Amino acid sequence: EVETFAFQAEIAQLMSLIINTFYSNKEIFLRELISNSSDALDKIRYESLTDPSKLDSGKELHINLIPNKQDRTLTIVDTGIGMTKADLINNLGTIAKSGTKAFMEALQAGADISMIGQFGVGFYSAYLVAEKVTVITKHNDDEQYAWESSAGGSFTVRTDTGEPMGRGTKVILHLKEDQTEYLEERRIKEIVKKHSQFIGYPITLFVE
Numbered sequence: 276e277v278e279t280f281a282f283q284a285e286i287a288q289l290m291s292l293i294i295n296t297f298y299s300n301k302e303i304f305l306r307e308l309i310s311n312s313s314d315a316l317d318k319i320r321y322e323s324l325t326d327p328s329k330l331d332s333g334k335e336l337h338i339n340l341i342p343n344k345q346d347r348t349l350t351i352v353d354t355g356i357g358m359t360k361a362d363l364i365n366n367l368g369t370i371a372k373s374g375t376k377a378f379m380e381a382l383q384a385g386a387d388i389s390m391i392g393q394f395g396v397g398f399y400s401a402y403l404v405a406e407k408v409t410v411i412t413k414h415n416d417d418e419q420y421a422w423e424s425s426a427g428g429s430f431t432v433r434t435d436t437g438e439p440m441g442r443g444t445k446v447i448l449h450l451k452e453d454q455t456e457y458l459e460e461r462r463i464k465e466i467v468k469k470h471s472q473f474i475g476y477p478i479t480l481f482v483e
């Protein structure tokens with residue numbers, strides 16, 4: 276069964292700003308999500324220092340970038356800490372409320388969209404290039420979940436019956452029709468080199 280939830284009003288507002296504002300420098304979505312992955316990998320790494328059993332669900336700490344032209348998706352995969360149901364439905368939204376407001380304020384004073392990550396809400400930059408985002412995630416303390424949103428003010432959560440992922444998070448970007456450049460190998464490489472060059476975890480760009 277699929278539960279449908281309303282975004283907090285501020286988040287829905289931010290999402291619509293991201294979708295509606297004319298802003299050509301869309302490529303920053305990728306460093307935002309890679310950075311989110313890196314924080315999540317840092318978290319499970321730190322936690323395992325005092326409980327090595329936390330790595331029973333997978334020892335490898337890394338990031339995969341997987342384009343698929345047939346499906347028109349770009350997937351960012353990590354083996355970080357993963358998200359619980361509570362994170363998905365409640366906690367992320369609660370923390371995002373302040374960041375969103377600060378960001379929206381900054382945006383006059385003349386900040387720009389590329390600065391979204393300094394407000395801890397970089398995830399929503401996915402909406403610069405994706406019409407729909409699906410997030411598959413698994414935390415040690417919980418079951419595997421599928422979060423999904425095409426914006427418009429709501430998101431869904433369901434327990435995921437797909438392939439089990441061990442531990443971590445996959446963000447599946449269903450790209451907008453005019454955003455398929457982000458499926459191209461050389462465009463992805465270029466972006467990773469420019470914005471994510473010093474991430475402390477292996478980043479593997481899959482080819483097709």
Ligand SMILES: COc1ccc(OC)c(Cc2nc3nc(F)nc(N)c3[nH]2)c1
Nearest residue numbers: 311312315356357358367371398410444
């Ligand atoms: C639905 O997913 C999100 C919604 C809002 C949001 O930041 C407001 C984030 C940001 C984020 N949180 C994450 N937690 C883990 F363990 N791994 C990741 N790769 C994560 N990315 C995710």
